[PDB]
Design a protein around this ligand. Structure first.
Ligand SMILES: [Mg+2]
Ligand SMILES: [Mg+2]
Lengths: 733, 733
C-alpha cells in the first residue's frame, strides 16, 4: 500500500546499475565515498562512531543522484560497550526475559552510535565442542535455541510483529548462519557439512525458523556447503525453505566475502557463482563485489532476469523503509545520544545481574564439612591463574566495540568490591599454555597476557608463596577468549597443560580451591570433577564479569545457570548429545561395559555433565507429575504439573525442564526432547507448582516424507532439573 | 535359463504357507534345531562347525522333513578358515587384487571342505572413523579401492566367470555386508546412528556394495544401523529401490544377528509390525530373530503382507539353493575325506605368509647415530630381543574374526622368529608390560580366548626384566600395539594411542641406546606422532594371520621387501576425526605451508594434515616416477602413462596410484579421488612403464539430482606413490 507505492516510484527512477548497487555491501575502509557518489553502495558494515556514520550518510543523501540512505551494520553479538556474557553463557541463564533485555540494551547502545543493523543473533545448533563458534550460539537443542532466537530478535527489533523498528533504539537483527554451520565436519571452522533432510528439520533448522517467525529483518547465508552446494548458492534453502515454506519477507545477505569463496569451493568463476547466488535468493553481497562486478553482464547474457534483480533490490529498499530511513536518513545519528545511552550504570547493573544468573555451578563439595561455596566475607582470598588479572579477556570473543583495556579483571574487581571485608591477593601462577606460539595466536585481537620469560617453576613458586598467605584459593583458569569464536577450532578440549599443573599444586596446599572456569566451549573435565572441591563455569561474563563472579562466590547471588550444551568425557565421544536415537542395541542403565551393545571399550556412554545440568547453593525437591488426563482426545490438550520445594538453606532459582519421549515412531525418535522450561525463584523452605500445557503441536516432528505430524501412540512426559533427573508420567494421543 | 524356474515352480506349488515362511528362517545351531527342521521351519543354519555334524543335520532336512529341502550352512569366514590371512584392513594394504582373490579362494576351499556353503563376507563398509573397531574387517576409506576388493573377494569365493559360478564343490556363496553405511556410525560407536545425504551416500559410501552385486554376489546382509531414521532392515528405499530396481540385484537379503527384533529397541514398533515392514522392504531371510516365523502368516491373514510378497522372498531362498547345486546334490559339501586334504596344508599356509609379508606397511625406517644403514632390514646375526605383550601370544596372531581358527596352533612372534632364524640369530624374549594398566580393560580386550595370562607382577618388575634381556641383545623388536579383540565388532575406542604401560615400556627400550623396531599390531589407524618422532623404525604388521610371525621375519630380516600401502588415513589425533584423503576444498582452504592462519579452515592446536596419508607406505628401496605422458590433451579414451625406476639397492614391489581431480563441478567435488592403481615389481635398477586408461565412465559422479554424469571441463590427472606426492598433468572433457 504505502510502502509498495513508495518503492514502486523510487524503483521507476533507478537504472539497472543503481539497482545492482543497492545489493552491494562493502566495508567503509575518502575511498568509499566515490562508490556512494556513483550510486554503488547499498549499505556499510564495520564503520564505528555516530559522527562518522552521519557524515557518510550525508554523502549518500546529498551526493548520490537518488539520495537513497544507507544501512550501517556491525557484529553486536553480546553487547556494544556494556558487554554481556558470550551467547553460550547467556543461554545457560534459561531466562528468556533477561535475554531479551540484553538485546534491548545492545540495540540501545549501538543505535546511540549510529548502527541500525546487527549481525546477530547466531542460532546455529552445535553438537561438536571443537568448533569455537559454539560460544556465539545457544547450545545443542533446537527448542531452547528457538526461544532464544525469539528473545534476541524481539529484543533488538521490538516485541510486536506489526510494530517493530519504529523507535530510534530498535535496530534490524540478522539471524545467522543459515544453515547447519555448526556441523562443520571434525569441528574445523568452514569445513564440509553433510546430513539428511530429516535430520536438518527435526534437529537443526528450527532456530532459524523461530527467528523468521519472530520478525527478523535479514538472514545471513553460511560459509559451509550443504548437499554439495555452498549455502550462498543453494536455491532450495534460500528460496524453497526460507521463502516458500517459512514465509520470510526480508532479505538475504552473504557472510564476509561469501560469494567469491564459492570459487574456492569448486563450483565455477565469479560470474557463474554470482548469478547462482542471486538466482538462489541471495539479495546482498558483503565485500565480494560479485554482484556489482557481474550481474549486469549476466543479465546481458540472459543468465539473470530483470525480475530476479528487481526482487532483490526491492527487499533492500523495503528494509530501509521499515527502518524509517526514507522518512529520516539520520534516525540513528544523534550525536547527543552516546553520552546518554552507552555504558550507563543501569545497563551495567543489568549485565552484571544476568552474568551471575548465567554462571553454572558444576561442583560444590567440602574442603569443616560445609560446602566450599559460598565463601565467607573475611580473611585472605588469593586469585591465582592466567585469567586472574587480565582485563581484555573478560568480555569474551566477538565484542568488537568493547573497551578491552577499561573493564576490571577478576583480581581488580574483587579487590574493589571486597574493600574493607576481604584481603584479595594475586599470583599469575602459569602461562596460558606452555607453547608460546600457541598462546600468541590464542590471545590476538588485543587479548595478550604479556607473557614473560619466567620459568614455569618461578611462577609456580610465587603462586605457592602467595597461597600460603591465604585461606581460600580462587583458581582463575581455562581459555583465553580468543581460544573460541571464529576460526578457533580445537582438537583438544582439556585445561591447558601448565594450568592443570598449576591447579594440582594449588590442590596440594590443602587449602580450599574454587576453580573459576573461563571458556567458550564445553571442556573435558573428568579430572577436575574428581579432584577440585568447587567448580564454577563462568564462561566469559562480559564487561561486569569480575563483580558477578564476586556476587556468586560470596553468596550475594545464588547460582542458577544450567548447561545448554553437553560436556563429554573425552574428545572421542563427539558428537555426544542428549537427544539421540535409541539404536537397536542400547546399553541399558548401569551395564557398561557389555559386549555386543552400543558402547565403547575404554569409557562409558555418559557425558560428564548432561544437557540442563546446574547445581545450586540450595537443593530442590520434586513431587511426582500430575497429568490432567492420560489421553489427549479428552480435551485436545493436557497439563503436566509438579511442585518444587526448596529444601536447603538458601533462597534460590531452579530451571524446571520439560522433556518428552515419543516411544514408537514411523521412524526412530529421540529418547527425549526438550519441549518446555520454566525458571522459578524459591525462598528457602517455600514450594511452588510448575505446570506445562501439552498440546498436539508440541508432539509434532518431520516424518520420513518430511510431513510435520503427530502420530497416535504413547509418550513419556518428564519434568526435572536436568535431562538425567526427571519424574516420568505417561500420555497417549 | 528356464530349467531353474520350472523346478522351483514345481516345488513351491507343493508348499504350505508355513513351509514357505520356514525357508525364511535362519537360526543358530545350538535335537539342537532338529525339532524345528523336522517341522519344515528352517531355511538354513549358521555357526555349525564340522562337516560330519553338518552332514548329519543336512541328512535330517533331506530325510526327516516332509519336503526334503536341503539347508545352507553359513559362517563368518572373513579372512580365513584355519589358514588365517591378515585381517581385511591389513589385507587391503597389499593393493594386490590377484593375491586377494586367491585368499578368498583358499578360505572357500577350506570352508567348503568342512561343509560350509555360505560365508558372511566380504565386509565392504566404507569408514573414515578409526574409533570403530570394525574397520579391521573392511577395505579402508576409499570406494574405488573398496569396490575392487569387493570383486576380488566375491570372485574368490564363488568363481571368476559371473555366468559360471558356484558349480564346483570348492566355490561357496558370498554375502556382502553390511548394506548399508554401517561404517559411519556416529561418534565411532558400533550400532550407533548413521545420518548423511543421498548425495554423500552414492559419491562416497555406496559403490562397494554395488561392485559386489556386479561381481555376482549371491546374498546381501542388512546392517544394524538406521538410515534416514529407518533401520536398514526396514528400509524399502534401500532394499528394493536401490538394491534391486537400480542395481539389478538378483539374490536374497539376510539380516544381521537378530536384526529384525532389535528394531523394537530402534523404536519403530512391535515384533509383528517390524517383521512385516522388513519383508515388505525386501528382506528375505531372518537371522535368529524368529520374526518371520513368529508373525508373517498372522500379517498375511490380517492383510498386511501379500502372498506374492511371501512367494518372492521364498523363491530367492530356493534359487540360492539351486544355484549352489544343492537340490541336485544336497551333500555337495559333505566329504568327510576333504578336511585332511584341503585344510591347513603347506600350500595354503605358504600363500598366507606371502600375502601377509606383502601387506605390512613400512611406516618409518630412519638411520640413527653413526649407522651407515637404516635399522631395517635387520642383519641375520647376533641377538635380537622380542619384547612386549604381543611378542609371545599365539592366540592374538590371527586377528579378530577368525572364528574357525585354532588359537593354540599358530606360532607367536617370538616362536616363529626363533625357529625360522635358528643358527643365524639368537632370539630372546621379555614380556615387558601388560597390555594396558586397567586389568578389567585387558580382560575385555582379550576375551574369546585371547588371554595374555596377566600376572600379579608390578610394572617395574616386568620393566626390569625386559631391560635385562635388552642389555644382552643387539637389536630390539618392540612387539607392541593392540590385542586382536580391541578391534572387531563392539570394540570401539575413544582413545587411539599406544596403551599407557606399553608406551612406558617403549620409552625405556628407546633409552637403552640399542636399535629399536616398533612392530605394531593393530586393527585400526592409531595416533602415533610421538612414535613417528622417537622410534627409528616402525612396521605396521596389522594382524598377519596364522603365518604372521614367519612373515614378520621375512620382512624384518630382508628376504621380503615391504610393499604395503595404507588404505586408511592415520590422523595425528582423535580431534581430527573424520580425516580422509578425498575431502572437499571448502571456501577458505588453508594453503600449503600456511598453518596457522586465522580465518582459514584450520585448527588452533594442530595442522590439517594426517600423520600418514592414504596410499602411504615405504620400501627398503626407492621408486622414482617420470612425468606423465598423456596420449592426448582432451578426451574414445586417453592414456595416462609414467615410467617407474627402482633406483635403490633391493628388488621390491611398488603400488602406483592414479588420482583425478574434477576442478569445477555443479556441486563441490573432492580435491582428489583414487581412480586406478597397479602393483608392479622391479628388480634393483629396473624400470617399468605404468599406463592407465582414462574414459568418461571413469569421470562420472552423482550430481545434485543423483544423475550419474561426467561434466565437460577440466581435470587434473595424477600418478604417484601415495595420495600426497604425485606427478600432475591435465585432461579436458
Ligand atoms: Mg509415536
Ligand atoms: Mg568439472
Amino acid at each position: 500500500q504505502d510502502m509498495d507505492r513508495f518503492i514502486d516510484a523510487l524503483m521507476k527512477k533507478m537504472t539497472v546499475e543503481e539497482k545492482i548497487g543497492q545489493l552491494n555491501l562493502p566495508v567503509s575502509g575518502s575511498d568509499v565515498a566515490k562508490k556512494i557518489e556513483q550510486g554503488l553502495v547499498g549499505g556499510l558494515l564495520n564503520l564505528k562512531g555516530v559522527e562518522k556514520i552521519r557524515d557518510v550518510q550525508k554523502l549518500a543523501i546529498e551526493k548520490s543522484r537518488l539520495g537513497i540512505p544507507l544501512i550501517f551494520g556491525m557484529d553486536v553479538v553480546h553487547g556494544y560497550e556494556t558487554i554481556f556474557p558470550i551467547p553460550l553463557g547467556l543461554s545457560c541463564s534459561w531466562d528468556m526475559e533477561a535475554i531479551r533485555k540484553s538485546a534491548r540494551v545492545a540495540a540501545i547502545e549501538a543505535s546511540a552510535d549510529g548502527i541500525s543493523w546487527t549481525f546477530s543473533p547466531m542460532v546455529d545448533i552445535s553438537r561438536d565442542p571443537r568448533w569455537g563458534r559454539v560460544s556465539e550460539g545457544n547450545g545443542e537443542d533446537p527448542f531452547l535455541g528457538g526461544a532464544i532466537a525469539k528473545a534476541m530478535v524481539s529484543g533488538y527489533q521490538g516485541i510486536d510483529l506489526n510494530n517493530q523498528l519504529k523507535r530510534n533504539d530498535e535496530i534490524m537483527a540478522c539471524v545467522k548462519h543459515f544453515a547447519l554451520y555448526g556441523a562443520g565436519e571434525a569441528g574445523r571452522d568452514y569445513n564440509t557439512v553433510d546430513m539428511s533432510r530429516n535430520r536438518m528439520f527435526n534437529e537443526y533448522m528450527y532456530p532459524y525458523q523461530a527467528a523468521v517467525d519472530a520478525g527478523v529483518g535479514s538472514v545471513m547465508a553460511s560459509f559451509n556447503e550443504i548437499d554439495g552446494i555452498p549455502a550462498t548458492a543453494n536455491k532450495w534453502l534460500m528460496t524453497d525453505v526460507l521463502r516458500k515454506q517459512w514465509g520470510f519477507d526480508g532479505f538475504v545477505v552473504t557472510d564476509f566475502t561469501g560469494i567469491s569463496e564459492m570459487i574456492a569451493h569448486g563450483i565455477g568463476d565469479l560470474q557463474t557463482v554470482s548469478a547462482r547466488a542471486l538466482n538462489a535468493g541471495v539479495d546482498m553481497d558483503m565485500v565480494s563485489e560479485g554482484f556489482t562486478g557481474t550481474i549486469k553482464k549476466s543479465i546481458d547474457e540472459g543468465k539473470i532476469s530483470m525480475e530476479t534483480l528487481d526482487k532483490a533490490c526491492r527487499r533492500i529498499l523495503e528494509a530501509k523503509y521499515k527502518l524509517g530511513l526514507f522518512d529520516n536518513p539520520y534516525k540513528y545519528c544523534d550525536l547527543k545520544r552516546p553520552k546518554r545511552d552507552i555504558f550507563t550504570k543501569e545497563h551495567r547493573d543489568a549485565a552484571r545481574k544476568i552474568a551471575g544468573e548465567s554462571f553454572v555451578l558444576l561442583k560444590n563439595d567440602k574442603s569443616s564439612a560445609n560446602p566450599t561455596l559460598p565463601l565467607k566475607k573475611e580473611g585472605t582470598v588469593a586469585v591465582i591463574g592466567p585469567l586472574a588479572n587480565t582485563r581484555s579477556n573478560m568480555p569474551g570473543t566477538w565484542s568488537v566495540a568493547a573497551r578491552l583495556n577499561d573493564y576490571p579483571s577478576v583480581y581488580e574487581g574483587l579487590k574493589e568490591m571486597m574493600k574493607g571485608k576481604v584481603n584479595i591477593t594475586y599470583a599469575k601462577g602459569s602461562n596460558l599454555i606452555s607453547d608460546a606460539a600457541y598462546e600468541e595466536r590464542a590471545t590476538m585481537f588485543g587479548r595478550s597476557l604479556n607473557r614473560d620469560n619466567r620459568t614455569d617453576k618461578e611462577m609456580l613458586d610465587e603462586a605457592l608463596k602467595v597461597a600460603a598467605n591465604a585461606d581460600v584459593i580462587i583458581a582463575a583458569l581455562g581459555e583465553s577468549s580468543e581460544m573460541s569464536g571464529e576460526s578457533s577450532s580445537r582438537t583438544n578440549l582439556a585445561l591447558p597443560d601448565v594450568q592443570r599443573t598449576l591447579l594440582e599444586a594449588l590442590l596440594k596446599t590443602g587449602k580450599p580451591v574454587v576453580l573459576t572456569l573461563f571458556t567458550g566451549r564445553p571442556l573435558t573435565l573428568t579430572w577436575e570433577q574428581e579432584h577440585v572441591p568447587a567448580i564454577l563455569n563462568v564462561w566469559f561474563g562480559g564487561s561486569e564479569a569480575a563483580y558477578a563472579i564476586g556476587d556468586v562466590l560470596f553468596g550475594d547471588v545464588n547460582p542458577s545457570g544450567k548447561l545448554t550444551m553437553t560436556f563429554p568425557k573425552n574428545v572421542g565421544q563427539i558428537p555426544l548429545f542428549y537427544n539421540h536415537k535409541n539404536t537397536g542395541r542400547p546399553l541399558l542403565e548401569g551395564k557398561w561395559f557389555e559386549k555386543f551393545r552400543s558402547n565403547y571399550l575404554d569409557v562409558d556412554n555418559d557425558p560428564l555433565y548432561p544437557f540442563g545440568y546446574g547445581l545450586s547453593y540450595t537443593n530442590f525437591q520434586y513431587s511426582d507429575i500430575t497429568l490432567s488426563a492420560p489421553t489427549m482426545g479428552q480435551d485436545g490438550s493436557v497439563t503436566a504439573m509438579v511442585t518444587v520445594t526448596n529444601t536447603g538453606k538458601y533462597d534460590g532459582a531452579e530451571v524446571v525442564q520439560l522433556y518428552i519421549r515419543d516411544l514408537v515412531g514411523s521412524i526412530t525418535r529421540p529418547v527425549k526432547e526438550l519441549k518446555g522450561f520454566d525458571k522459578i525463584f524459591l525462598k528457602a523452605g517455600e514450594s511452588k507448582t510448575v505446570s506445562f500445557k501439552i498440546t498436539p503441536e508440541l508432539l509434532r516432528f518431520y516424518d520420513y516424507e518430511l510431513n510435520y505430524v503427530a502420530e497416535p501412540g504413547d509418550f513419556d512426559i518428564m519434568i526435572g532439573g536436568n535431562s538425567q533427573s526427571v519424574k516420568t508420567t505417561h500420555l497417549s494421543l
